[PDB]
Amino acid sequence: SMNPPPPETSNPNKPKRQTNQLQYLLRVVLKTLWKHQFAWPFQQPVDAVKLNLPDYYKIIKTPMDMGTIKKRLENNYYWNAQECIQDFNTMFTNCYIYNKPGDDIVLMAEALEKLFLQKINELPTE
Numbered sequence: 001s002m003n004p005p006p007p008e009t010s011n012p013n014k015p016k017r018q019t020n021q022l023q024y025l026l027r028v029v030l031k032t033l034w035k036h037q038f039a040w041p042f043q044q045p046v047d048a049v050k051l052n053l054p055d056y057y058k059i060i061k062t063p064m065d066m067g068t069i070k071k072r073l074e075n076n077y078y079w080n081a082q083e084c085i086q087d088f089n090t091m092f093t094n095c096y097i098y099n100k101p102g103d104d105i106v107l108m109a110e111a112l113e114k115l116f117l118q119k120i121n122e123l124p125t126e
């Protein structure tokens, strides 16, 4: 029921960048979402051995989670806010793909996605 390696949080041959939008994504968006009552399933990579989901990575080929995103933001791994936003969207979409409408985990993702969209609706200007 193997777990693949978690997504990279550093890559020396990829250029780094810091922007006002990226700082905001860490300080306000991620750190606020992190505290939500429904955030806990999304704070680390899915552990298929722990959670007894041997087929998780049979289905999900581009895993993403907020722990990974947090480390990426802390590393200045991203070039721009859009790249980070893409990771959040991958995380939510993975959840919808792996599960089914109405599942408790999906209700959690739906709630977080709404809050996420609420917070990125307006970003700082650079």
Ligand SMILES: Cc1ccc(NC(=O)c2ccc3c(c2)N(C2CCCC2)[C@H](C)C(=O)N3C)c(C)c1
Binding pocket: 040, 041, 042, 046, 047, 051, 053, 056, 094, 095, 098, 099, 103, 104, 105
């Ligand atoms: C309702 C719920 C919420 C969390 C957990 N415990 C997790 O470790 C956990 C972390 C992340 C996920 C997850 C479980 N589900 C499970 C649960 C939903 C049906 C499959 C699937 C793989 C998913 O897509 N994600 C993101 C449990 C046991 C039940």
